[PDB]
Design a protein around this nucleic acid. Structure first.
Lengths: 255, 23, 33, 507, 33
DNA sequence: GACTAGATCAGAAGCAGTAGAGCATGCATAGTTTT
């Protein structure tokens, strides 16, 4: 097989499960004219370890480095598979211009569909992004779900609803937490299911969950009447009976 | 004999360079 | 929890390939013209 | 001192060497390997013609000429190189420890007599001349053979034989859970038992710290630049040797390599006439010089004959008071002149007499110096140099003559005339305070050449494939922060007292 | 679960935004020219 | 008879150090051009 006829390759990595001399022997077997030091004629410089030599080659933009997996792919398929962003660890300006046309700033390509593995590589590429705030993120998620019609998914269906609970002896009093009851686990499951649990009884509250204690129903009704927007009174039975169905059951039967 | 080099026999162990140490 | 991740991956794949097809069509039509 | 230094690194491979007393600490094996690598690097930089070897005892496999059991000779005596350091680098950690256990083995018996026999056999194989022979024993077992008395006697006999042959034995004891007692067994094996080295040691030996101190300066053995004749008269002649106690250190010269296989390439320079194109021997060319709108042609032999004044040697001229010599008349690094009895017998006595009486009378011997043939003469002054020793009786200033080169009229230059403006006493006093604040003690070995140190660090990083080169601290850089802190308000007062309000030195 | 969901969604929206930017650049500039 | 081992002399190669030539950096000074 002369798939690597009249080409130049250099290796500066011995720190791998395959020793460098074995790689040189394979290269010679495949027809690539091995070279021990890169130069203007070399079509690549493969080095699987970021040692000092790789960093020096990086500091000069005159050539490009390739992850050793490229040779493995070439040998397994016996074909001259081109480069892709996953393999390369640095590009010359010209190769950068070439890639930018058929590839985004991230490994994901423009003209070829994607597979789960490729998307995983893309999602492992960039570093991080923590420039948002809870409200902004929630608004973004809601916009995406509404646009692309993903609300039928089992989860995230409580997102549009803000939920309050009677976990305080006195409404709007954070110093009288009633922790130690089934209401706590009810709320924790609700929030796990994408419900926006609110600890303050603001005018924007839309859903309220009440347990077996109906003493303060009158106060809730009075507050609802006072507020411009009315929030339906709901019991803990509705969420329980709805969890198994994975759907929002009608509030009429649980008003 | 005293203060001899354990790496290069026949040479005295040079003290490490200390630079400027103000009094 | 063990499955929400793949549930999200599926939707992301669908939308991304849709957009990729859109750009493919746009560039192909323009290049032909 | 003639020959090469030979060193053998014996490393124990028993179980006790692979256990860490504390979680955040180095096992004895790791410390030994670090020390071996440090000595290898120091030898590469300092003395590259020395011989080093590495041996293991207590292992399951065996590799030696005598086909003994439980002794693995990893590296036979050969000059150091990067490959050997890399080979040792695969035992530098826990994974390296597992690799070592798999490759050789550990936890087996052994006999010290066989180990010392293998070391002596390694010494015998060397075909060069060895000035020193040394073995370092890295172990943490103070009683290797407590059960068997016969093995102890055999080890003692072999150690005595090795000492008789001229082999130094050193014990580099590593940390032990119960403490290391040299008194038990290793007194007889060790070459020298110091008086202070008799108590039980609860920590590794102080020699490991010196081993891990990397030396990155070339150590050149004593050598005479020239053996010359000092001629007081046409009949009185003595033999002297010239040495250089100060010599500039240069980077090793680059070599030219071929790119495709990294093999050296040899170069050759030739001159060929433009018209014919053939080679021209050096005998088919002349020399030219233009002066007064004319061309003057001379042969090469005459060009060299122009430089012949007198035969090589030192010719006495007289004696000069040391006051007439000047410190700002420095021209070239000074040399050292010492007697030499090999060529002329009785030179030492006359040299000693001259040195003693020159010191007594405070004079320097003026001489005409011609080092080699075809070199025009220079004028030198031999200044007496007495013997000065430090507290530990280590000689720091040798006895002899210091050869200082004196300039000719052509070597000086004319300075632009500058009017003198003297300073009032207050400015001098303020600057005296500033000077006194920044006083410090100076020694000739208090600074390092940043360029050479960085070069060696870079070369080591490239050779051993390290992640990043180690960065040398430059001691020549001023400590601006400390100086600012110490001086305080002196600088401001001096600037107010000496500079006009609107001066702006920077601009 | 909350952390995983938010992280993955941020991940996806970044890529979607980049793809949208490139498609928009094409469709607008290259069509107009 | 054959063969081996120890000592010694000579030549040669390696290394160190100096000298001489060449290459790049910057500026002094003056000259020339422009306004």
């Amino acid at each position: 097989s002369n798939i690597f006829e009249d080409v130049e390759f250099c290796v500066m990595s011995g720190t791998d499960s395959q020793p460098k001399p074995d790689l040189e022997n394979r290269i010679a077997e495949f027809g690539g004219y091995i070279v021990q030091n890169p130069g203007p004629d070399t079509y690549c410089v493969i080095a699987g370890s970021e040692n000092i030599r790789v960093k020096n080659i990086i500091l000069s933009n005159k050539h490009d480095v390739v992850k050793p997996a490229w040779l493995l792919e070439c040998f397994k398929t016996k074909s001259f598979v081109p480069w892709q962003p996953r393999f390369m660890i640095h590009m010359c300006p010209s190769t950068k211009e070439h890639f930018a046309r058929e590839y985004d700033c991230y490994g994901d390509s423009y003209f070829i569909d994607t597979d789960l593995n490729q998307l995983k590589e893309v999602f492992s590429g960039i570093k991080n992004s923590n420039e948002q705030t809870p409200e902004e993120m929630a608004s973004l998620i809601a916009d995406l779900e509404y646009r692309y019609s993903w609300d039928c998914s089992p989860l995230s269906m409580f997102r549009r609803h803000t939920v309050y609970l009677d976990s305080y002896a006195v409404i709007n009093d954070l110093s009288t937490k009633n922790e130690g009851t089934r209401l706590a686990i009810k709320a924790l499951e609700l929030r796990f299911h994408g419900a926006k649990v609110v600890s303050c009884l603001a005018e924007g509250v839309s859903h309220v969950i009440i347990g077996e204690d109906h003493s303060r129903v009158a106060d809730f009704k009075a507050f609802r009447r006072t507020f411009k927007r009315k929030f339906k009174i709901l019991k803990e039975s509705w969420v329980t009976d709805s969890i198994d169905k994975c759907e929002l059951q009608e509030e009429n039967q649980y008003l | 004999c005293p203060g001899e080099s354990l790496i290069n026999p026949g040479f005295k162990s040079k003290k490490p360079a200390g630079g400027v140490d103000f009094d | 929890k063990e499955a929400l991740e793949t549930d999200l991956y599926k939707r992301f794949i669908l939308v991304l390939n849709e957009k990729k097809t859109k750009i493919r069509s746009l560039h192909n039509k323009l290049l032909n013209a | 001192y003639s020959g090469r230094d030979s060193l053998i690194f014996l490393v124990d491979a028993s179980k006790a060497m692979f256990e860490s007393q504390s979680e955040d600490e180095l096992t004895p094996f790791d410390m030994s390997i670090q020390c071996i690598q440090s000595v290898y690097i120091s030898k590469i930089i300092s003395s590259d013609r020395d011989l080093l070897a590495v041996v293991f005892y207590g292992t399951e496999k065996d590799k030696n000429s005598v086909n003994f059991k439980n002794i693995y000779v990893l590296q036979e005596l050969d000059n150091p190189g990067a490959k050997r350091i890399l080979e040792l680098d695969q035992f530098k950690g826990q994974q390296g420890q597992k690799r070592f256990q798999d490759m050789m083995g550990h936890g087996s018996d052994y006999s010290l007599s066989e180990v010392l026999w293998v070391c002596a056999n390694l010494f015998s194989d060397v075909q060069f001349k060895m000035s020193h022979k040394r073995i370092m024993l890295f172990t943490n077992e103070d009683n290797p053979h407590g059960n068997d008395s016969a093995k102890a006697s055999r080890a003692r006999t072999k150690a005595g034989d090795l000492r008789d042959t001229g082999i130094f034995l050193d014990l580099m004891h590593l940390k032990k859970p119960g403490g290391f007692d040299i008194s038990l067994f290793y007194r007889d094996i060790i070459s020298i038992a110091e008086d202070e080295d008799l108590r039980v040691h609860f920590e590794e030996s102080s020699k490991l710290e010196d081993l891990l101190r990397k030396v990155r300066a070339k150590e050149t053995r004593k050598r005479a630049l020239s053996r010359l004749k000092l001629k007081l008269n046409k009949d009185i002649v003595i033999s002297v040797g010239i040495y250089n106690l100060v010599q500039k250190a240069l980077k090793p010269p680059p070599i030219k390599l071929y790119r495709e296989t990294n093999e050296p390439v040899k170069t050759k320079t030739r001159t060929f006439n433009t018209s014919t194109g053939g080679l021209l021997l050096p005998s088919d060319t002349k020399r030219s010089q233009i002066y007064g709108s004319r061309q003057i042609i001379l042969e090469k032999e005459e060009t060299e004959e122009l430089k012949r004044f007198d035969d090589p040697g030192l010719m006495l001229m007289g004696f000069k008071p040391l006051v007439l010599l000047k410190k700002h008349h420095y021209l070239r690094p000074s040399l050292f002149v010492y007697p030499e009895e090999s060529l002329v017998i009785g030179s030492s006595t006359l040299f000693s007499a001259l040195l003693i009486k020159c010191l007594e009378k405070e004079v320097a011997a003026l001489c005409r110096y011609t080092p080699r043939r075809n070199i025009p003469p220079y004028f030198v002054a031999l200044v007496p140099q007495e013997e000065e020793l430090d507290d530990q009786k280590i000689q720091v200033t040798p006895p002899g003559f210091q050869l200082v080169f004196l300039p000719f009229a052509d070597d000086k230059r004319k300075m632009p005339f500058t009017e003198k403006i003297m300073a009032t006493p207050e400015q001098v006093g303020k600057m005296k305070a500033i000077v006194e604040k920044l006083r410090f003690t100076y020694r000739s070995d208090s600074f390092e050449n940043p360029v050479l140190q960085q070069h060696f660090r870079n070369l080591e990083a490239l050779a051993l494939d390290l992640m990043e080169p180690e960065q040398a601290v430059d001691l020549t850089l001023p400590k601006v922060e400390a100086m600012n802190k110490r001086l305080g308000s002196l600088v401001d007062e001096f600037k107010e007292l000496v500079y006009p309000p609107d001066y702006n030195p920077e601009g």
